[PDB]
Design a protein around this ligand. Structure first.
Ligand code: CLR
Ligand code: CLR
Ligand code: CLR
Ligand code: CLR
Ligand code: CLR
Ligand code: CLR
Ligand code: CLR
Ligand code: CLR
Ligand code: OLA
Ligand code: OLA
Ligand code: NA
Ligand code: ZN
Ligand code: ZN
Lengths: 641, 641
């Protein structure tokens, strides 16, 4: 029967009568037309569903109305309105105008007839345009997909899908232009790239991956919300979606950002060179060695698991096309070669460059001291605090190792990797507190085993607390007992000294209270703030004790105190901007994704990598230079606190 | 049109003519009938395919002939014969006999008519019986599935599928009894458990998982062999398959095997008790302490990555139903609780029980030595070899830590976990060689860091060689250089002594040559044989040097030598029986799965865990007791080699 587009057809189908409709249309060359078939049935009997068959030249598509979904825990869902887009045939210029015919056959085996309504329409907005936002709606029984053709200049695009509400949750899949299109929840993840989506989704594609420089963006709504961190839930679950296809940054942005990263850090090298030059002009005109290596060994022992894991996770993402596995920022994930997010790795360059600079600065001090000790300078031998540079070498190397470990985490950030980003800073903050204590008490043995053992136990507490003590009121109660007791014990060792000890313990008790009351899910970041607080508290205690003892703070140490405080306040702010959350579902993390802040390449977490290295670098300089005033004062006179 | 079952229908379909067939059958209660629809079209034009629609009461099924598959690297496959089993409806006794009607509609849009052949048949062997082998055939375009109902007495079954040839490779999926059945490669992995299969597959199921105590066993043949370690490849890819449903072992087998494992090892405790009792009757009638703890720290540092990984892999297996992720011996993987293969973890009880026994043996001699020294015994003080039991405590605790590390690996053995099965044995073999050298050269410092560092570097070489040096002629050439040079340097320090050194280098050179020519993919096991070989060579050198120096081998040490040699020969044999291979694909590894050898619970790899612990336990006793004859001899008179 000849039928018209955009015309709603009603009918009753029983065993005897089947209703057939014929739609003929012409597709002009270089023009793609998609036909959407909508059938709905208001029939109580699901024992006798309305069966819809759409036959085209090269394909037959069949479905049933009401569409039934099997839910978790034996939940049943039925969708009375079912809509499908028929795979489009694109006429090349050579083929010419193509006359195509669609047959929509409607049948039912019901003894009394079952009613249905049919609307077949042509999609006027099937093709998606660049930098244009398109708003649409999808349902579990009404999946939608659209066509995008890569423009010549554009060699890569990002697919940004936004929703106002978290649920129902969807799947955004990118597939090549070949029939069939997998737009059902039972085959959508078979082919191509896909992401789970509650509120936001971002898929980055390259032209070389797709033949014909075109793809289909498929939007499938799940009958239930379980895979996307939701409780559950026969009635329309319409999701209002907006999708925009934006070109990615050009290769020039990669060059400008890599140069910027190296240059800000190399600027520090120039600044150290200028200071060194002034001393050279003045000169002409006028806790051990197994520690540098130990930090390496500990880092390598710790790097091996993550690196082996990276391979396997990277493998599974590439094959399955599951962008769910790695918790990238997505909105600012910039790919170089294999790396999905090169920008994250590049941000860790400062840790390596700044850590290296520190080793060179420490070395000059060691070489100069050693030369002075040989010359038997009175000041080198008997004036000032005895100088040991071993912990300083470990600190510099640890900063570099932190950069490498953080970069490894960023190859695939996820639940198995969560610790590695900020963990080595527990070692960095731990080493810095020994250097403070060793300054006055240079008699502390400090075995290599003790560092390795402490790190292992601290990480053991960290990983165990995240996995098994996620939010339990029990775990946080026990941990608060250790935290407070550790603070009491430490305070008595490292420490008006009494008033300072009270302030010192109180800050730790306050932190324990915040943790107990708030129960943060990110125990790794909470554990990190425990080491940062105690590092800054002991550093502040040292400065206060230095002032009460009338010891001076020279301009070079004093500037580093201001820079350390300013950089720590700035770095912590960018640390508190959560752009992805491995504790939640992949769809929940993606709601936190943001467009990146600096040079269109670096996000808030990238700035935290720049500023954490600079804050840690300037913290090293405070320890290195603070007691340089005493170099004139006799060691005998020098007090001990 | 009324049509007959098991009758082949021919017809020509053009735009004008569609051919419709009606098949009616009666399903008796408590009787399941499945109908298979076969359509084959020998039509050159794939632009105009034959479209087949099979409509039933509940659902409608449609497909096209020839069936087209999109292959990797743009390969195209077409199958003129397509066959499908229609979702059976099971009549309960209450419903009674049910008269069901099937409509098979055949259509084509070809201008000249396209021929087809149709056979609709009822499957007389749809239901699978217990302990009965059923042989069938499946094709990429002709998937098959069958029904199994759990017997009342049987609470769990294993699905064993066997094929004579590796390719074409298949997917065996287990799904609940609900329509639709996902029997296509684009939806087979959506629901239920599934395994990839080349030659063998084994799926273990429990009755509690399935409602109705029934499931579908779905067999889907892949159009290509890539996922199963093979290459490409329009023509039938028929796979002859045999599937048997066998009940799993009863809970009594779990109890009898757990008791056996504890008892053989506790028997050793009784044997040590009997020896201790005889000495107590005789008595009445007449390289340091930071090492025990260090091995713990190293093991914990090493246990943390694997344990965190276990959680995430175990998660993904449970959700997706993908049995391909872990590399168990599925033919004897027995589950207890959350563990998929409990027998693999129980087999590691020998390490902890025999490692604990050795610590009690060392402790006695440590206590009796200190008690003597307190009593100023002449023989304890000036006769015999200086006694340092510190490395014995490390060896005993390392054996325990190897049992827990090997048990953690067997929670989910895979490519990310490879090292954990045998890596700590490198530590054990290395500790045992230091104890040998420390015996006649008591003045060796042996720092804790050195053990940790050596382990880290040795594992770094092991993991790097497996991942990046899989079979390269380059990597094995460099490694043979280190292996020859390391053994050449070691031979000079520890080793007619000259003839022995020559024999000692030839064995290492031979091992290197075997590796160089053979290029084993399992570098972890090859690395293990390097440590075992040198441990037994240095042990044999010590015995030979003991005999040439006219020093006796007492009966207790001498028995341990025989037991160590016999157990090492026996353990190595069960080590060479590869029942699973993480280096290959999951389907390739399943080809080596075997039914398990001992008590219907333990396979060849489980026996290697029993015998490796016993060989390592008796190796410890050789070191502990060998020089107990020198206790009467004065320390000065004792030679050093
Ligand atoms: C690994 C990171 C967290 C740094 C850890 C530093 C701390 C926790 C480690 C490193 C050095 C260690 C100390 C080394 C020296 C001594 C003095 C000794 O008589 C008692 C142990 C004690 C007090 C150790 C306590 C723990 C210790 C302070
Ligand atoms: C905060 C972390 C990272 C670093 C803390 C350094 C701590 C662990 C170190 C530095 C100084 C050390 C103390 C130095 C002096 C003494 C006195 C001695 O009779 C007992 C050990 C004791 C009490 C040490 C315990 C460990 C100690 C307190
Ligand atoms: C988790 C937070 C709140 C507390 C962390 C406590 C950690 C840093 C403390 C508690 C127990 C400590 C260990 C106690 C025992 C030893 C042996 C000794 O040779 C010093 C190192 C070592 C290994 C200590 C390292 C530091 C240590 C692990
Ligand atoms: C704020 C937290 C992380 C600091 C934890 C470090 C402090 C409290 C821990 C770490 C290592 C611990 C020390 C480990 C070993 C010794 C030597 C022993 O003879 C006295 C106790 C003493 C000195 C412990 C005191 C508490 C201790 C110093
Ligand atoms: C895993 C295996 C190789 C462990 C073997 C450990 C023992 C047997 C080996 C490994 C390192 C070796 C030592 C390496 C360096 C020296 C310093 C030299 O001036 C005397 C010999 C001595 C002390 C060697 C003795 C033998 C030695 C201790
Ligand atoms: C089987 C082959 C690959 C093993 C080779 C191991 C070699 C390369 C590694 C493993 C253990 C390592 C040693 C561990 C202990 C020490 C003592 C330390 O004070 C200096 C480094 C030194 C000397 C290391 C040198 C390199 C080393 C000998
Ligand atoms: C752990 C597995 C992989 C192998 C273990 C090897 C251990 C036991 C061996 C291998 C390398 C050896 C060290 C190599 C370096 C030296 C030289 C000298 O300065 C003291 C002995 C010492 C420190 C050796 C001690 C024993 C040692 C650490
Ligand atoms: C694999 C078989 C052959 C055993 C391997 C023995 C290795 C681990 C042993 C044997 C010879 C040893 C080396 C001999 C020479 C030295 C002394 C000093 O310069 C540092 C340790 C170092 C470098 C040793 C490291 C460990 C060593 C390389
Ligand atoms: C004197 C104060 C020193 C600095 C204290 C810092 C306090 C940090 C405490 C933990 C907060 C963790 C919860 C929210 C942060 C999440 C980290 C992230 O977004 O990646
Ligand atoms: C004197 C000889 C001492 C013992 C030497 C043992 C030799 C072992 C060498 C490596 C063989 C590795 C290749 C095949 C074994 C695979 C291990 C496995 O099946 O799990
Ligand atoms: Na099913
Ligand atoms: Zn980071
Ligand atoms: Zn094992």
């Amino acid at each position: 029967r000849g039928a018209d587009f955009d015309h709603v057809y009603s009918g009753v189908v029983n065993l005897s009568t089947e209703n057939i409709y014929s739609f003929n249309y012409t597709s002009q060359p270089d023009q793609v037309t998609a036909v959407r078939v909508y059938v709905n049935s208001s029939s109580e009997n699901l024992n006798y569903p309305v069966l819809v068959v759409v036959r085209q030249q090269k394909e037959v598509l069949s479905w049933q109305v009401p569409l039934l979904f099997q839910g978790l825990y034996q939940r049943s869902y039925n969708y009375q309105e079912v809509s499908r887009t028929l795979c489009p045939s694109e006429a090349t210029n050579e083929t010419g105008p193509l006359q195509q015919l669609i047959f929509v056959d409607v049948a039912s085996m019901a003894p009394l007839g079952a009613q249905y309504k049919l609307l077949v329409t042509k999609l006027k907005h099937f093709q998606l345009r660049t930098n244009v936002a398109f708003h649409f709606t999808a349902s579990p029984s009404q999946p939608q997909y659209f066509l995008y053709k890569f423009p010549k200049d554009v060699d890569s695009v990002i697919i940004k899908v936004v929703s106002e509400m978290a649920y129902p949750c969807s799947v955004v899949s990118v597939q090549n232009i070949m029939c069939p299109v997998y737009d059902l929840d039972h085959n959508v993840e078979f082919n191509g790239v896909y992401q789970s989506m509650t509120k936001k989704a971002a898929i980055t594609l390259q032209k070389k991956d797709f033949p014909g420089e075109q793809f289909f963006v498929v939007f499938v709504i799940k009958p239930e919300d379980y895979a996307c961190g939701g409780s559950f839930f026969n009635l329309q679950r319409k999701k209002n979606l907006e999708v925009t296809i934006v070109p990615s940054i050009k290769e020039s942005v990669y060059v400008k950002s890599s140069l910027f990263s190296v240059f800000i850090f190399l600027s520090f090298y120039l600044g150290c060179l200028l200071v060194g030059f002034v001393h050279y002009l003045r000169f002409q005109r006028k806790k051990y060695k197994i520690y540098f290596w130990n930090i390496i060994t500990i880092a390598v022992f710790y790097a091996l698991p993550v690196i082996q894991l990276v391979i396997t996770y990277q493998t599974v993402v590439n094959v399955t096309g599951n962008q769910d596995i790695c918790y990238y920022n997505f909105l600012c994930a910039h790919p170089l070669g294999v790396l999905s997010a090169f920008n994250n790795i590049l941000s860790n360059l400062g840790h390596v460059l700044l850590g290296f600079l520190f080793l060179l600065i420490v070395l000059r001090r060691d070489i100069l001291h050693r030369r002075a000790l040989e010359a038997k300078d009175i000041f080198a031998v008997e004036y000032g605090i005895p100088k040991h540079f071993g912990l300083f070498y470990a600190m510099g190397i640890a900063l570099m190792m932190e950069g490498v470990l953080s970069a490894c985490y960023h190859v695939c950030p996820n639940y198995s990797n969560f610790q590695f980003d900020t963990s080595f800073m527990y070692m960095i903050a731990g080493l810095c507190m020994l250097k403070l204590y060793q300054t006055r008490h240079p008699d502390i043995n400090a075995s290599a085993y003790s560092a390795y053992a402490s790190f292992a136990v601290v990480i053991m507490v960290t990983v165990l607390g995240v996995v098994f003590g996620k939010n339990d009121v029990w775990f946080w109660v026990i941990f608060s007992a250790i935290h407070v007791l550790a603070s009491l014990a430490l305070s008595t060792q490292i420490y008006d000294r009494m008033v300072l000890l009270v302030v010192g313990n109180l800050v730790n008790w306050s932190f324990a209270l915040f943790g107990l009351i708030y129960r943060p899910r990110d125990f790794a970041s909470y554990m990190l703030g425990i080491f940062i607080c105690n590092l800054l508290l002991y550093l502040a205690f040292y400065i206060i004790m230095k002032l009460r003892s009338s010891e001076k703070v020279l301009p070079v140490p004093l500037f580093c105190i201001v820079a350390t405080a300013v950089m720590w306040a700035a770095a912590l702010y960018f640390f508190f901007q959560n752009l992805s959350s491995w504790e939640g579902t992949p769809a929940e993390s993606r709601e936190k994704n943001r467009e990146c802040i600096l040079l269109d390449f670096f996000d808030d977490h990238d700035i935290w990598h720049f500023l954490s290295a600079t804050a840690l670098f300037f913290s090293f300089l405070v320890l290195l230079t603070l007691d340089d005033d005493l170099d004139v004062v006799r060691r005998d006179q020098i007090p001990v606190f």
